[PDB]
Amino acid sequence: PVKLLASGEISRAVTVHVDAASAAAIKAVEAAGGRVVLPE
RNA sequence: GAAAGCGAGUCCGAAUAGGGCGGCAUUAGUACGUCGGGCUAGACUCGAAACCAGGUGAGCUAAGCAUGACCAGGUUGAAA
């Protein structure tokens, strides 16, 4: 698959399309611009 | 972490002690080569008594079977 995890930190707007992501993973993206996108 | 799975966190547990991990002041690898050593192969070299497989042997020897051969001379003296 493809998971998204929260390690890096600088803040900015970017929309990711990972096949999976963690809690604060998402709750870190949009929280600075961008959209986490999981398969339907 | 047994795993689902969760994620810089995660397994114990019903939350608070710990184990493993990140951060730790720091810190990358990977491909090819020479080499040290490991592993699996006969595995530094040489040596076994033995075990297993297929065949060669009764022209020696142990016996069988068919067909032939041989036993001076003397002694004794059974039945009838």
mmCIF file of C-alpha atoms (C1' of nucleotides) in Angstrom:
data_model
loop_
_atom_site.group_PDB
_atom_site.id
_atom_site.type_symbol
_atom_site.label_atom_id
_atom_site.label_comp_id
_atom_site.label_asym_id
_atom_site.label_seq_id
_atom_site.Cartn_x
_atom_site.Cartn_y
_atom_site.Cartn_z
ATOM 1 C CA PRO A 1 0.000 0.000 0.000
ATOM 2 C CA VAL A 2 1.276 3.503 1.046
ATOM 3 C CA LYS A 3 0.867 4.941 4.534
ATOM 4 C CA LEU A 4 1.389 8.589 5.520
ATOM 5 C CA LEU A 5 3.019 9.352 8.844
ATOM 6 C CA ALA A 6 3.852 12.490 10.839
ATOM 7 C CA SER A 7 7.621 12.893 11.148
ATOM 8 C CA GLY A 8 8.605 16.053 9.271
ATOM 9 C CA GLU A 9 7.490 19.455 10.563
ATOM 10 C CA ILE A 10 7.555 22.929 8.968
ATOM 11 C CA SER A 11 3.858 23.560 8.130
ATOM 12 C CA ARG A 12 2.480 24.425 4.658
ATOM 13 C CA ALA A 13 -0.425 23.680 2.318
ATOM 14 C CA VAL A 14 -0.140 20.457 0.327
ATOM 15 C CA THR A 15 -2.690 17.867 -0.732
ATOM 16 C CA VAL A 16 -1.626 14.219 -0.364
ATOM 17 C CA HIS A 17 -3.163 11.109 -1.882
ATOM 18 C CA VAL A 18 -1.614 8.343 0.263
ATOM 19 C CA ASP A 19 -3.371 4.978 0.267
ATOM 20 C CA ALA A 20 -3.418 5.250 4.065
ATOM 21 C CA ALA A 21 -2.496 7.805 6.699
ATOM 22 C CA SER A 22 -2.463 8.150 10.449
ATOM 23 C CA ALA A 23 -4.495 10.296 12.800
ATOM 24 C CA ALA A 24 -2.217 13.293 13.420
ATOM 25 C CA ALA A 25 -0.966 12.397 9.958
ATOM 26 C CA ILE A 26 -4.033 13.970 8.410
ATOM 27 C CA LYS A 27 -4.523 16.211 11.440
ATOM 28 C CA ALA A 28 -1.373 18.043 10.400
ATOM 29 C CA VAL A 29 -1.804 18.472 6.648
ATOM 30 C CA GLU A 30 -5.087 20.285 6.187
ATOM 31 C CA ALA A 31 -4.225 21.949 9.466
ATOM 32 C CA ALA A 32 -1.898 24.017 7.250
ATOM 33 C CA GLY A 33 -3.503 23.525 3.863
ATOM 34 C CA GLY A 34 -3.903 20.393 1.778
ATOM 35 C CA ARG A 35 -6.154 17.334 1.617
ATOM 36 C CA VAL A 36 -5.468 13.752 2.643
ATOM 37 C CA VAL A 37 -7.166 11.447 0.092
ATOM 38 C CA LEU A 38 -7.993 7.794 0.898
ATOM 39 C CA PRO A 39 -9.476 5.279 -1.602
ATOM 40 C CA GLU A 40 -13.264 4.823 -1.504
ATOM 41 C "C1'" G B 1 3.099 -6.390 18.726
ATOM 42 C "C1'" A B 2 1.296 -13.339 19.020
ATOM 43 C "C1'" A B 3 -1.718 -10.962 15.656
ATOM 44 C "C1'" A B 4 -5.831 -7.405 14.129
ATOM 45 C "C1'" G B 5 -3.424 -3.479 13.657
ATOM 46 C "C1'" C B 6 -1.643 1.161 15.469
ATOM 47 C "C1'" G B 7 2.422 4.681 14.243
ATOM 48 C "C1'" A B 8 7.599 7.978 16.044
ATOM 49 C "C1'" G B 9 5.084 5.485 18.595
ATOM 50 C "C1'" U B 10 3.724 0.518 20.225
ATOM 51 C "C1'" C B 11 2.766 -3.873 22.751
ATOM 52 C "C1'" C B 12 1.439 -5.275 28.908
ATOM 53 C "C1'" G B 13 -2.892 -3.067 31.698
ATOM 54 C "C1'" A B 14 -9.077 -1.309 32.615
ATOM 55 C "C1'" A B 15 -4.041 5.334 32.262
ATOM 56 C "C1'" U B 16 0.163 6.410 33.919
ATOM 57 C "C1'" A B 17 5.578 1.338 36.465
ATOM 58 C "C1'" G B 18 8.106 -0.959 32.655
ATOM 59 C "C1'" G B 19 10.063 -3.596 27.702
ATOM 60 C "C1'" G B 20 11.282 -2.584 22.604
ATOM 61 C "C1'" C B 21 11.811 2.193 19.233
ATOM 62 C "C1'" G B 22 12.428 7.056 17.748
ATOM 63 C "C1'" G B 23 14.798 12.138 19.649
ATOM 64 C "C1'" C B 24 19.247 11.984 22.278
ATOM 65 C "C1'" A B 25 25.346 16.465 21.382
ATOM 66 C "C1'" U B 26 25.632 13.462 17.104
ATOM 67 C "C1'" U B 27 26.295 10.869 13.231
ATOM 68 C "C1'" A B 28 23.772 7.678 5.919
ATOM 69 C "C1'" G B 29 24.158 4.047 2.814
ATOM 70 C "C1'" U B 30 24.924 0.975 -1.027
ATOM 71 C "C1'" A B 31 27.330 -1.730 -5.513
ATOM 72 C "C1'" C B 32 31.909 -3.916 -7.093
ATOM 73 C "C1'" G B 33 36.860 -5.720 -5.596
ATOM 74 C "C1'" U B 34 41.070 -8.016 -2.246
ATOM 75 C "C1'" C B 35 41.015 -10.064 1.988
ATOM 76 C "C1'" G B 36 39.480 -12.365 7.617
ATOM 77 C "C1'" G B 37 35.788 -15.742 9.226
ATOM 78 C "C1'" G B 38 30.718 -18.341 8.731
ATOM 79 C "C1'" C B 39 27.470 -21.668 6.086
ATOM 80 C "C1'" U B 40 26.186 -25.679 2.498
ATOM 81 C "C1'" A B 41 29.075 -28.977 -0.892
ATOM 82 C "C1'" G B 42 34.479 -34.467 -1.119
ATOM 83 C "C1'" A B 43 35.967 -29.540 1.985
ATOM 84 C "C1'" C B 44 43.356 -29.288 4.812
ATOM 85 C "C1'" U B 45 45.649 -34.889 2.678
ATOM 86 C "C1'" C B 46 45.974 -39.869 3.329
ATOM 87 C "C1'" G B 47 43.532 -44.630 6.251
ATOM 88 C "C1'" A B 48 38.719 -48.319 8.350
ATOM 89 C "C1'" A B 49 36.496 -52.771 10.151
ATOM 90 C "C1'" A B 50 31.490 -52.320 7.751
ATOM 91 C "C1'" C B 51 26.561 -51.382 4.813
ATOM 92 C "C1'" C B 52 23.961 -51.336 -0.045
ATOM 93 C "C1'" A B 53 23.297 -52.426 -5.519
ATOM 94 C "C1'" G B 54 24.200 -55.253 -9.996
ATOM 95 C "C1'" G B 55 26.884 -58.974 -11.746
ATOM 96 C "C1'" U B 56 31.373 -63.084 -11.917
ATOM 97 C "C1'" G B 57 32.485 -67.853 -9.932
ATOM 98 C "C1'" A B 58 31.194 -75.493 -7.964
ATOM 99 C "C1'" G B 59 37.317 -75.583 -13.968
ATOM 100 C "C1'" C B 60 39.679 -75.504 -5.881
ATOM 101 C "C1'" U B 61 36.475 -77.312 -2.270
ATOM 102 C "C1'" A B 62 31.269 -79.322 0.043
ATOM 103 C "C1'" A B 63 27.519 -82.351 -1.929
ATOM 104 C "C1'" G B 64 23.684 -84.467 -5.992
ATOM 105 C "C1'" C B 65 22.687 -86.724 -10.655
ATOM 106 C "C1'" A B 66 23.917 -89.863 -15.372
ATOM 107 C "C1'" U B 67 27.611 -92.921 -17.358
ATOM 108 C "C1'" G B 68 32.440 -95.575 -16.983
ATOM 109 C "C1'" A B 69 36.956 -97.371 -14.422
ATOM 110 C "C1'" C B 70 40.017 -99.777 -10.139
ATOM 111 C "C1'" C B 71 41.169 -102.968 -5.604
ATOM 112 C "C1'" A B 72 48.795 -107.965 -6.004
ATOM 113 C "C1'" G B 73 48.824 -111.572 -2.986
ATOM 114 C "C1'" G B 74 47.921 -114.145 1.272
ATOM 115 C "C1'" U B 75 44.423 -115.404 5.940
ATOM 116 C "C1'" U B 76 39.976 -116.889 8.155
ATOM 117 C "C1'" G B 77 36.077 -119.847 7.300
ATOM 118 C "C1'" A B 78 29.282 -118.118 8.332
ATOM 119 C "C1'" A B 79 24.478 -120.136 6.399
ATOM 120 C "C1'" A B 80 23.130 -123.887 3.587
#
